[PDB]
Design a protein around this nucleic acid. Structure first.
Lengths: 941, 372, 358
DNA sequence: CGCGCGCCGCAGACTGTCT
DNA sequence: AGACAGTCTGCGGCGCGA
């Protein structure tokens, strides 16, 4: 109805916040702050007015409406947890049942077979045999009433499929037979996501309304270890501060139980039959393994009992608990194209590495000569190798065609006489000697003959070895790379030899020219450039595109090796995790009627889900941690296997509706500093860069910097991203490293002269310093995060370390705030999907991003809901602190991606194999501000 | 140039000095030598293993060299098209299948200028043709799959796989296809073509009814599109032989002059020989080893019938130019301790190894060379 | 008779039932052979190569073009072989006793009044000293007769006879006794300097080879066998109430047949694929009889696999998911045996080796 | 930068041999 | 009973991602 801007683009209309606290009349401070060093003048480009009828609010006020939503979400689960918290726990049974299905043990150890554990609350654990690792092997559970065990068909010996449909254990009963909690169940466990991966009903597309709690998540939120803190904790089994050792523990169950419960130490199996054992040995040692698993389950139950009140008091707001429950429900659907993608990626990796392997084995074989004439001694590359040799240690006319050739067998048995020589002699060397005749350096590169995975030639020869550079590699004029203590110079961060060969290859004592030919056998080499940390593998790729770096055979061999290494590095690192992902393929009966009735439903095709097995709070900032899914490469053409995200494809009749928060960390820091400075949203200069900032003009955060080299795309952005977080002086010298690498004292003087985003003694920040709020939060010891409250850790709290690991503490604020944002988004999305019939409650777990598996017929509606959350969430960040209003620029997501697969942008093809049309995946056509025409009620349009 | 004289010294390219780039590429060469024949047989066997044997639905078919009115054949595709209907019964109408064949095809060669060849000067080329009947919906998927598979096969057994390349192309009718080339020293030469005919030939040769040509790709029955994958092996042999040789490098100082062919398609694997010692009691051992290796299936150069011995070092060069993986020497010391020498292709280092279990060593060397 | 109908139905001979006939099969004027016939031809050619070329170290492969380059499709591989005799002389170090072998297609006129019939033939030309020419002729005749009788179920049908043409001094010819009568399947000829120095006129100083010094003139022995007639003879030998068609284990186109009985789950297809890969990695050809529509019948399946001359029928049932036992049915003894999965590959390899040895 | 998760090459210290 | 092969096992070095 009105612009309602107040000199900045502010969110149009106010529906839930109400009208009060109009202005503090302290605008002059922000005015002459923005006047200083320019930046006051602004176009102030308007945005289209948005008029939306929000759903009714039960709370009647923000920060109470969300409290009511979280309470209504987590009431049954908190009730179940409280029921589990009471102590009515019987002792462990004397002997386990050893029977298929679920078996319950009440008093005196009597075992009764039961179809399903009829318990509202459970503490669950599954132990899995590494052989055929997809199947769950065995599992146990404990409730306040009785114990439960599950074996997974170990009495009968058979051959089983790799699909793993019915393999996972059943844990949910039918909705028609539920306790009067009621239809709500909570499962507690250490690394509970691993156990959730083995639950039969957790793979259905429809919602399961069962939630999970992770003991590692609660421990990490309460008391976790970050980076050196963890390693030092292992080192002691930090300077002038080690109190945190007594309140900190690693994420392992044993140390967690030692820290919290403090009972007798838990002991692990030296046999580790589940990890390094076969199935038969597990069958024989069934009782001991089940006893150990039950002991671990008891330990996790005790830890949960000791954790729940501490977690609740350190995280009072129910929104955090509800978001934690919701984050452990990620689905990540997939279809038959997942296996095809895995096979294609493996084949491509084998192709690329085989090409490079052959190219290297050729050089190795050609270099295996030069030993006959002792030519390696005069060689300028291979004279350092040992070149050892070890002993074995032991006419007559045509005469006719002849006949009676049947006696040929005589000579055959003559050959057998030499077989007899195996026994009559050879006993002086019974162990098979490995290539005595070849040089020792070539000897090392070949696989042992007894190896089942044996291939001809020096197959154990890849890049980044100490011999491959000597085979061909050469820099400038100087040929040698001794690497005895330090390699051949280079890299980013600093810190008999035939002289006749040195003269021939030309084209204290000191050196007239720093580069050029190497001189003398003294390996000190004057310490030029980085010495010890030079791999000579990757960083030199753009430095190699000139005469400074040249390979032996050809000018394109070295570049080809570097390019192929870059292509296959990611897959070499990640193929074990990616190919080992657990996939459960749903049968036709399990799929809903919508999927089978939908067109383009590929019959004779496999559909399933890959539960990410993600730790909800694996990082001390409560951030979700998963090695593969959360940390995976975006689709790229050069890198092999980068299309991992694109293979998360919704089933027929379903789609992924998600979004991405625009500069979540930067906006959070900006608004926090803005609130710390004044009460308006554009008061801080950094806030004005973040809010209403354009790269076209100087209003952008990175463009206004000095930019000594003069680049805004790369030079000015890495500088800004490094000054925040660490704010290191070596990071300042890295700019001198990049360009203008001269006059180092001048570089230091220039860096000192840069006061922007910097503070002096006259302590606290002055002028454009957002760090003041972060430092104030970092030294409070009360519930620290400004949004809804969350303490950092008893390990990293003040009075445990005085001034140590400060950077981790200050980044925890903006990082923990992002996690709270994610929790708020999840709570709002759950509320919106429950209040209005929007089927497809499932979500996909990503950091700074939330994707939801929805039906096509509500693809746009759900998107609108997301935008509504993106409003109501940011309003929370406004409701806390002094910012009563919210800017219009960040009020909504830039674009809501509706797609059939998971990718950063829907208008993007991976083209890793350069055939993106092999799988049916069209564009997404994201919607931004065009969804407001509809309403969230189903009976619309 | 030098490669050509090497090939002919060791009876690989063929006979007489008439062979050149144009005659070799056009198929007008007088014929391949015994080593050339062995290389062709090995390449055909590898192609058969990669295409026909390892695939359940691909079947062998035979196409007559001439067709009735007849002017011989220029491609093997027509025979596969004629056998489509007959072989549909064999696959019980499982539509996505194929017919593979290897045979000699005839092409006109135009020398031009003097001695106009016209229809004469027929050039013979060994063509391996796979005609793959596919559903229309997934025709492009199978096109890409076959292109990738054939490029892998050609890059397999390749000393420098980067020389092999692929390109896209469109027919005069607009039909998609791909062409694979090998980068010879003079330039890239075509060695294989994949074409997506799109079921035109089926209706052309069977215009009566379509109901008899229907094949099941699932619940429904459709008229298959045709994917013709036609590669030539003579140019394949030329490509592999040129790739095995060196260029035409800096501070090389190595002049071994060796044809580093792949172990799987090398013409001769191991060469037997006799060391310095008493005649007889060594010829019998060599004969027994020869019989063992032939019963295994490893081709062996006898080598122990020659009596020059070429000072023991020139014959190593002869075998290297002959593309022989191993040189087995049986000396008088074999009767005392059953140990023989192994020079081996590449890494010209003497290997002492017991005569026993050489069966296992050679079989494993041949089998494990295919994989990496 | 029923032989032609059975081979047509089971894709041994390609074409129509009425078009194949009998006389068109003896000549090359027939549509061709089915995939089973092609595989049988490949096996026969490979075994001929093993018995003739590799075993005899002197015999070398030769490459002869299908057409004469100047003045025509070739009618025999002998003339094609003789062009490279001089070049292959250097390879053998001019030692006179040595051979040149090739398997290739040859075209003949058949009295569209005149038709062109193409048949694949295996030809070896053996250059020897003239004095030992007759001894080598007898040696080759004996070895060829042994080779043809090795795979015969009734070796008495393979016989030999003496022709003694007016051109060559001595010669032999091998016959197979088809039901209608004897048919020539291989010819043996001894030729002197005739049509050897003709192709190389002038001084014979370049064409002669050394044998006990003295550089004696060569004498050629041409041995030419018809492989298509060979398969015809072997297929007629296999046949004999049941339509069994007992082909030799080394010559049968398909060794074993993979199939499924009760189809409880899809895992049967997985284990069948695994067994397929394992068998094919070792060189054993197996017909993928599984993945067939709903398992129409079992006894009819056995009859079909017999008519295709499959050595063994492998049936995978539900019990195979408990132990490795599968049903193995023998073509000859029509006996069924429970047999573990892991022992199938080695068992088949040893069976093939034992059949080859005897 | 500040962290989260992975891998792969190379020098030393046990057995574990063997003649 | 006095020299040299396998395993771990601890070091340094990658790569990759919000």
């Amino acid at each position: 109805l009105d612009i309602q801007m107040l000199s900045r683009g502010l969110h149009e209309q106010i529906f839930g916040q109400g009208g009060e606290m109009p202005g503090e009349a302290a605008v002059r401070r922000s005015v002459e702050h923005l006047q200083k060093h320019g930046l006051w003048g602004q176009p102030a480009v308007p945005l289209p007015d948005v008029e939306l009828r929000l759903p009714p609010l039960y709370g009647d006020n923000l920060d109470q409406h969300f409290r009511l939503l979280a309470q209504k979400q987590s009431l049954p689960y908190l009730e179940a947890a409280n029921l589990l918290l009471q102590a009515q726990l019987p002792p462990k049974p004397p002997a386990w049942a050893w029977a298929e299905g679920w078996t319950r043990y009440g008093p005196e150890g009597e075992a009764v077979p039961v179809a399903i554990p009829e318990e509202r609350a459970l503490v669950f654990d599954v132990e899995v045999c590494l052989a055929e690792g997809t199947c769950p092997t065995l599992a146990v559970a404990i409730s306040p009433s009785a114990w439960y065990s599950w074996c997974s068909q170990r009495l009968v010996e058979e051959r089983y499929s790799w699909t793993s449909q019915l393999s996972p254990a059943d844990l949910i009963p039918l909705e028609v037979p539920t306790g009067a909690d009621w239809q709500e169940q909570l499962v507690v466990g250490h690394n509970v996501s691993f156990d959730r991966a083995h639950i039969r009903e957790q793979y259905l597309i429809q919602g399961s309304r069962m939630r999970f709690l992770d003991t590692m998540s609660m421990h990490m939120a309460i008391s976790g270890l970050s980076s050196f803190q963890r390693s030092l904790w292992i080192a002691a089994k930090a300077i002038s501060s080690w109190d945190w050792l007594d309140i900190s523990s690693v994420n392992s169950l044993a140390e967690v139980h030692r820290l919290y419960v403090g009972g007798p130490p838990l002991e692990k199996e030296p046999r580790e039959l589940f990890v390094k054992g076969t199935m038969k040995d597990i069958r024989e040692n069934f009782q001991d393994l089940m006893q150990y698993c039950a002991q671990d389950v008891w330990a996790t139950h005790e830890v949960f009992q000791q954790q729940l009140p501490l977690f609740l008091e350190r995280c009072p707001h129910p929104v955090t608990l509800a978001g934690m429950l919701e984050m452990g429900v990620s689905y990540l659907p997939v279809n038959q194209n997942w296996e095809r993608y895995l096979a294609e990626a493996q084949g491509t990796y084998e192709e690329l590495q085989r090409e490079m392997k052959k190219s290297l084995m050729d050089l190795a074989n050609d270099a295996c000569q030069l030993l006959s004439g002792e030519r390696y001694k005069e060689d300028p590359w291979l004279w350092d190798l040992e070149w050892d040799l070890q002993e074995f240690k032991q006419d007559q006319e045509d005469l006719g065609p002849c006949s009676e050739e049947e006696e040929f067998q005589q000579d055959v048995m003559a050959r057998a006489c030499l077989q007899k020589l195996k026994g009559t002699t050879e006993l002086l060397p019974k162990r098979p000697q490995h290539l005595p005749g070849h040089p020792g350096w070539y000897r090392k590169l070949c696989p042992r003959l007894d190896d089942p995975a044996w291939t001809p030639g020096p197959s154990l020869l890849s890049l980044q070895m100490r011999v491959t550079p000597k085979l061909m590699a050469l820099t400038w004029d100087g040929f040698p790379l001794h690497y005895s203590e330090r390699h051949g110079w280079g890299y980013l961060v600093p810190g008999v030899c035939p002289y006749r060969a040195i003269e021939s290859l030309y084209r204290p004592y000191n050196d007239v020219d720093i580069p050029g030919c190497w001189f003398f056998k003294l390996p000190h080499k004057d310490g030029n450039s980085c010495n010890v940390g030079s791999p000579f593998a990757k960083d030199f790729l753009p430095k190699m595109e000139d005469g400074t770096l040249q390979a032996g055979p050809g000018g394109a061999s070295g570049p080809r090796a570097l390019e192929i290494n870059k292509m296959i590095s990611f897959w070499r690192n990640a193929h074990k995790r990616i190919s080992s992902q657990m996939v459960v393929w749903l049968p036709r009966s399990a799929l809903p009627r919508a999927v089978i009735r939908h067109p383009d439903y590929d019959e004779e095709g496999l559909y399933g889900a890959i539960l990410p097995q993600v730790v909800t709070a694996g990082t001390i900032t409560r951030r979700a941690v998963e090695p593969t899914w959360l940390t995976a490469s975006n689709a790229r053409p050069d890198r092999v296997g980068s299309e991992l995200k694109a293979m998360v494809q919704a089933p027929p009749g379903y789609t992924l509706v998600g979004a991405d928060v625009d500069s979540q960390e930067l906006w959070i820091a900006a608004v926090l500093g803005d609130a710390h400075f004044a009460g308006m949203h554009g008061c801080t200069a950094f806030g004005w860069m973040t809010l209403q900032g354009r790269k076209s003009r100087g209003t952008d955060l990175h463009s206004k910097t000095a930019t000594t080299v003069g680049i805004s795309r790369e030079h000015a952005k890495i500088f800004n991203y490094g000054r925040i977080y660490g704010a290191g002086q070596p990071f300042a010298e890295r700019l001198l490293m990049q360009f203008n690498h001269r006059l180092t004292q001048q570089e230091a003087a220039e860096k000192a002269q840069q006061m922007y985003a910097a503070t002096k003694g006259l302590k606290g920040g002055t002028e454009s310093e957002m760090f003041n709020k972060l430092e104030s939060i970092a030294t409070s010891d009360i519930p620290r995060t400004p949004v809804l409250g969350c303490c950092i850790s008893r390990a990293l709290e003040p009075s445990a370390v005085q001034e140590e690991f400060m950077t981790s503490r200050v980044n925890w604020v903006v990082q923990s705030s992002a996690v709270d944002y994610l929790h708020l988004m999840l709570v709002a999305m759950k509320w919106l999907f429950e209040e209005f019939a929007i089927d497809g409650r499932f979500c996909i777990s990503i950091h700074d991003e939330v994707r939801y598996l929805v039906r096509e017929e509500d693809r746009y509606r759900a998107a609108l809901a997301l935008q509504i959350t993106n409003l109501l969430t940011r309003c929370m960040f406004a409701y806390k602190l002094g910012l009563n209003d919210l800017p219009q620029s960040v009020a909504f997501f830039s674009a809501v991606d509706i797609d059939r697969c998971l990718r950063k942008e829907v208008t993007m093809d991976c083209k890793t194999p350069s055939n993106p049309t092999g799988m049916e995946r069209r564009y997404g056509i994201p919607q931004g501000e065009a969804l407001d025409i509809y309403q969230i009620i189903e009976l619309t349009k | 140039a030098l490669l050509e004289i090497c090939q002919r010294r060791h009876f690989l390219s063929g006979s007489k000095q008439q062979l050149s780039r144009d005659s070799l590429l056009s198929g007008c060469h007088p014929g391949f030598g015994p080593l050339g024949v062995e290389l062709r047989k090995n390449l055909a066997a590898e192609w058969w293993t990669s295409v026909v044997v390892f695939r359940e639905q691909v079947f062998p078919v035979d196409a007559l060299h001439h067709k009735p009115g007849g002017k011989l054949r220029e491609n093997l595709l027509h025979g596969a098209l004629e056998h489509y209907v007959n072989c549909l019964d064999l696959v019980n109408k499982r539509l996505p299948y194929g017919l593979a064949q290897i045979g000699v095809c005839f092409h006109p060669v135009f020398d031009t200028k003097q001695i106009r060849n016209g229809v004469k000067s027929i050039g013979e080329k060994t063509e391996a043709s796979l005609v793959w009947f596919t559903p229309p919906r997934t025709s492009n998927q199978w096109l890409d799959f076959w292109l990738r598979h054939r490029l892998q096969w050609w890059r397999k057994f390749a000393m420098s796989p980067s020389n092999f390349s692929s390109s896209d192309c469109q027919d005069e009718e607009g039909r998609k296809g791909n062409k694979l080339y090998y980068n010879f020293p003079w330039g890239k030469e075509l060695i294989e073509t994949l074409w997506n005919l799109g079921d035109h030939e089926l209706l052309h040769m069977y215009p009566g009814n379509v109901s008899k040509l229907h094949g099941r790709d699932g619940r429904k029955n459709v008229v298959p599109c045709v994917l013709s994958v036609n590669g030539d092996l003579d140019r394949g042999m030329l490509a592999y032989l040129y790739d095995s040789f060196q260029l035409t490098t800096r501070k090389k100082n190595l002049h071994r002059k060796v044809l580093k062919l792949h172990p799987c398609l090398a013409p001769i694997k191991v060469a037997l020989d006799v060391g310095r010692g008493p005649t007889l009691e060594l010829r019998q051992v060599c004969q027994g080893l020869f019989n063992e290796l032939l019963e295994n299936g490893i081709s062996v150069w006898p080598g122990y019938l020659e009596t020059m011995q070429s000072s023991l070092e020139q014959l190593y060069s002869k075998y290297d130019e002959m593309s022989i993986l191993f040189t087995v020497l049986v000396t008088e010391t074999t009767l005392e301790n059953g140990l023989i020498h192994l020079r081996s292709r590449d890494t010209t280092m003497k290997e002492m190894m017991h005569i026993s279990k050489l069966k296992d060593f050679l079989i494993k060397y041949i089998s494990s060379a295919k994989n990496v």
